[PDB]
Amino acid sequence: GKIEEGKLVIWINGDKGYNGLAEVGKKFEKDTGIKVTVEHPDKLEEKFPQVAATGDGPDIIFWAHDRFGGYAQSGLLAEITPDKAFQDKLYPFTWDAVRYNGKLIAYPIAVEALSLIYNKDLLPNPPKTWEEIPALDKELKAKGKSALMFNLQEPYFTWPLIAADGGYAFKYENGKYDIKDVGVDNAGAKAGLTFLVDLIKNKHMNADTDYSIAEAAFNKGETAMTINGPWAWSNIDTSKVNYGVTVLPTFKGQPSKPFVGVLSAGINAASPNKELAKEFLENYLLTDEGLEAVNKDKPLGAVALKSYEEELAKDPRIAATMENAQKGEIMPNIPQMSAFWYAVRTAVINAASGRQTVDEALKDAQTGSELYRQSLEIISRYLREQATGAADTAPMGASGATSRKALETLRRVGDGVQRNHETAFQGMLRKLDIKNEDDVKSLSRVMIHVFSDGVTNWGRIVTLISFGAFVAKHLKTINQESCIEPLAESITDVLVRTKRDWLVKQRGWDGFVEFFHV
Ligand SMILES: COc1nn(C)cc1C(=O)N[S@@]1(=O)=NC(=O)c2ccc3c(c2)N(C[C@@H]2CCO[C@H]2[C@@](CN2CCN4CCOC[C@@H]4C2)(OC)/C(F)=C/C[C@H](C)C1)C[C@@]1(CCCc2cc(Cl)ccc21)CO3
Ligand SMILES: OC[C@H]1O[C@H](O[C@H]2[C@H](O)[C@@H](O)[C@@H](O)O[C@@H]2CO)[C@H](O)[C@@H](O)[C@@H]1O
């Protein structure tokens, strides 16, 4: 479809101040005659990449910054180019959250971190440790109350505990992420998640508790504590619960480490209203009055706009938010975050329900989180060595035995496919007529159509990759060697995105090696 000209459609999550945002839209309309429509669809962060890929969707999308690198990598976002005067009005670390491959890809709005929220009438002093919560629940159950209820369906809420004793997503050292170094199934992560599962086993929490259940229980005074962000404070105010916002409990003497989000506003690359969107965001929303309108609906947290943040920073709930933020870590925005989150969401749900043990659940989450990088390493190396006739001497890195053995297996079975199907490979190569970087970009839809819609097995995966190597050899011959790495990335994307669940079920590339073991 085509995004309509002369209006703005905005998407924002249903937990945020969308009525306040609509009020800013009405002010925009008053000046310009342009109607602003604010919507809060379910699963908007999943919807957006689907609809935007076809040139459809909202003009402006709001989400935490972690999803935006994926959207940008997919060509779904307009580059943001504010002048120095405007840039200097927001905190530099907030612009850093929305920078991807050296370009600004959204406007930052506000810094979000989870805090412990407690009912002062039930618990005059909140617990400093996770370890004391079982005893406190036992005390409270004798009064017809519980200690703690929070959303167990979204890993954002359980991550602070998983991270506390050493769980991590992608290792960060010397100002750099090692995307090859994933910390989901280490001893620290296991300790955190085992503690959560034990809370459930011992009937201190219920695996089925979700956002709405926890919110209602806290706001009705049935549970003494919850874990939530600034957006939740409005409904708690309405409830008249005597609440405090404080630092999350420690685990094994170490701080809980929330993953810190920057609510951000991106502009759809397919929007014909980009100048209207820029005007709205810079001169209506990111002003004291614009942020106030949203904040009075549902609190934003620590806003990116220095002038308004100076007012808000006096609020002890914001101080608490920022204390927790400083103990946590800013989320990456790398495209791999979506997969990391899906993998950890499934692990927590399965461990909490008893569908899998903690060890089983975190193993699968490690494999899912490593899948893209490991797949790319194997596929890129095979294509490149096939094209040039010489292997890559660089170390395989993390899970290197698997990568090496997968590459050796792929050499055996993939060369066999190419050899036996040479005429068919030649025919398809000529039919596809691949000449340059632009023609390579067209192959994804063809790969999805042919590969992803057929039967899922290792044989057809070998064919996918083997035909890729055949194409790579051709590209080298015609002085298009620079196209090979983009080709490898494209094949990897199709494989891992469309066969994610199947691949994890096979133990990823270890399953491949096992399947073709001679
Ligand atoms: C015991 O059995 C086996 N052991 N082992 C080890 C393998 C098998 C086995 O049987 N495998 S098999 O079932 N696999 C497939 O069929 C298959 C799987 C994935 C594919 C993939 C195909 N394709 C079409 C092929 C390529 C050459 O001619 C093709 C084919 C079959 N195709 C199927 C789709 N139709 C659509 C209409 O036009 C004709 C076309 C024909 O042609 C005969 C072929 F060679 C199949 C042989 C496979 C080995 C059979 C390539 C593809 C689409 C093109 C773009 C593009 C680009 C890159 Cl970079 C990379 C890939 C692609 C997607 O990836
Ligand atoms: O649970 C995984 C989920 O976490 C974060 O989403 C948060 C969001 O940042 C908050 O603003 C609020 O809406 O709660 C969400 C959790 O339900 C990530 O931003 C998101 O990408 C991820 O899927």
Using alpha carbons, list the distances in angstroms from residue 24 to 29, 181, 274, 290, 436: 9, 43, 17, 6, 46
Interstrand relation of 223-228 and 176-183 (parallel, antiparallel or unpaired) = unpaired
Pocket lining: 64 vs ligand 2, CB cutoff 6 Å: yes
Between CA 239 and CA 55 the distance in angstroms is 43
Atom 14 of ligand 2: nearest residue by CA position: 156
Q: Are 225 and 355 members of one domain?
A: no
Cβ neighbors of 344 (< 8 A, separation 6 or more) are 155, 159, 162, 184, 365, 369
Triad 205, 206, 210: Cα angle to 5°: 105
In terms of Cα–Cα distance, which of 190, 501, 209, 510 is closest to 357? Answer: 190
Between CA 107 and CA 287 the distance in angstroms is 13
Residue 390 is part of a domain; what is its CATH number?
1.10.437.10
Pocket lining: 368 vs ligand 2, CB cutoff 6 Å: no
126 with 235: CB under 8 angstroms? no
Q: Which domain holds residue 475?
A: 337-513
Q: Are 503 and 372 members of one domain?
A: yes
The resolution, in Å, is 1.5
3-class SS at 183?
A: strand
Atom 5 of ligand 2: nearest residue by CA position: 156
In terms of Cα–Cα distance, which of 420, 428, 415, 376 is closest to 398? Answer: 376
Pocket lining: 110 vs ligand 2, CB cutoff 6 Å: no
Report residue 251 as tokens.
């685990």
- Residue found under tokens 């402006």: 60
3-class SS at 25?
A: helix
Q: Is 206 exposed, middle or buried (0-12, 13-18, 19+ CB in 10 A)?
A: middle
Q: Are 496 and 410 members of one domain?
A: yes
Burial 45-80 (b: 16+ CB within 10 A, else e): beebbebbeeeebbbbbbbbbbbbbbbbbeebbbeb
Cβ neighbors of 19 (< 8 A, separation 6 or more) are 297
In terms of Cα–Cα distance, which of 321, 419, 411, 363 is closest to 184? Answer: 363
Q: Are 124 and 239 members of one domain?
A: yes
Residue 216 is part of a domain; what is its CATH number?
3.40.190.10
With left for phi above 0 and alpha for psi between -120 and 50, is residue 253 left, alpha or beta? left
Q: Are 398 and 249 members of one domain?
A: no
Atom of ligand 2 nearest to the CA of 67: 21
Burial 162-199 (b: 16+ CB within 10 A, else e): bbbbbbbbbeeeeeeeebbbbbbbeebbbbbbbbbbeb
Three-state SS sequence of 473-506 = HHHHHCCCHHHHHHHHHHHHHHHHHHCHHHHHHC
> Other CB atoms closer than 10 Å to residue 143's CB: what's the count?
9
Q: Which of 432, 433, 463, 512 to mutate to test the pocket of ligand 1 (most atoms within 8 A of CB)?
A: 463
Distance (angstroms) between ligand 2 centre and the Cα of 222 equals 25
Q: 232 - beta bridge partners?
A: none
Between CA 27 and CA 4 the distance in angstroms is 20
Ligand number with the minimum distance to the CA of 349: 2
Pocket lining: 15 vs ligand 2, CB cutoff 6 Å: yes
Q: Are 366 and 463 members of one domain?
A: yes
Q: 267 - beta bridge partners?
A: 60
Q: Are 484 and 353 members of one domain?
A: yes
- In what helix (H) or strand (E) does residue 159 lie, and over which residues does it extend? helix 155-164
Backbone angles phi, psi at 107, to 5 degrees: -90, 130
Half-sphere exposure in the Cβ direction for 92 (13 Å, CA): 1
Burial 245-283 (b: 16+ CB within 10 A, else e): bbebbbbeeebbbbbbbbbbbbbbbbbebbebbbbbbbe
Ligand number with the minimum distance to the CA of 263: 2
Report residue 303 as tokens.
């806003």
Q: 108 - beta bridge partners?
A: 264
| DSSP structure class, residue 220 | T
Pocket lining: 347 vs ligand 2, CB cutoff 6 Å: no
- The string of DSSP codes covering 370-407 is HHHHHHHHHHHHHHHHHHHSS---S---TTHHHHHHHH
Half-sphere exposure in the Cβ direction for 467 (13 Å, CA): 24
CA 109 centroid distance within chain: 18
Distance (angstroms) between ligand 2 centre and the Cα of 353 equals 21
Ligand number with the minimum distance to the CA of 416: 1
Between CA 368 and CA 357 the distance in angstroms is 17
Please report the sign of the dihedral spanned by the C-alpha atoms of residue 148, residue 152, residue 157, residue 162. Answer: positive
Pocket of ligand 1 (CB under 6 A): 413, 417, 421, 424-425, 428, 443, 446-447, 450-451, 459-460, 462-464, 467-468, 471, 487, 491
- Residue found under tokens 């805090």: 115
- In what helix (H) or strand (E) does residue 60 lie, and over which residues does it extend? strand 60-64
Between CA 107 and CA 49 the distance in angstroms is 18
Between CA 171 and CA 150 the distance in angstroms is 27
3-class SS at 147?
A: strand
- The string of DSSP codes covering 253-318 is TB---PEEEEEEEEEBTT-S-HHHHHHHIIIIISSHHHHHHHHHHS--SEESBHHHHHHHTTSHHH
26 with 49: CB under 8 angstroms? no
3-class SS at 39?
A: strand
Pocket lining: 156 vs ligand 2, CB cutoff 6 Å: yes
Backbone angles phi, psi at 275, to 5 degrees: -70, -40
3-class SS at 186?
A: coil
3-class SS at 419?
A: helix
Distance (angstroms) between ligand 2 centre and the Cα of 337 equals 11
Report residue 226 as tokens.
């919850």
Atom 52 of ligand 1: nearest residue by CA position: 447
Q: Is 495 exposed, middle or buried (0-12, 13-18, 19+ CB in 10 A)?
A: buried
- Residue found under tokens 């100002």: 175
260 with 113: CB under 8 angstroms? yes
Distance (angstroms) between ligand 2 centre and the Cα of 208 equals 18
- Residue found under tokens 């190569």: 429
In terms of Cα–Cα distance, which of 107, 65, 87, 515 is closest to 285? Answer: 107
Q: Are 481 and 366 members of one domain?
A: yes
Between CA 132 and CA 223 the distance in angstroms is 16
Between CA 368 and CA 192 the distance in angstroms is 19
What is the number of residues in the chain? 518
Using alpha carbons, list the distances in angstroms from residue 70 to 28, 41, 304, 344, 497: 30, 20, 22, 18, 13
- Residue found under tokens 């057929």: 454
- Helix, strand, coil proportions of the chain in percent (round to 5)? 55, 15, 30
Q: Which of 428, 435, 440 to mutate to test the pocket of ligand 1 (most atoms within 8 A of CB)?
A: 428
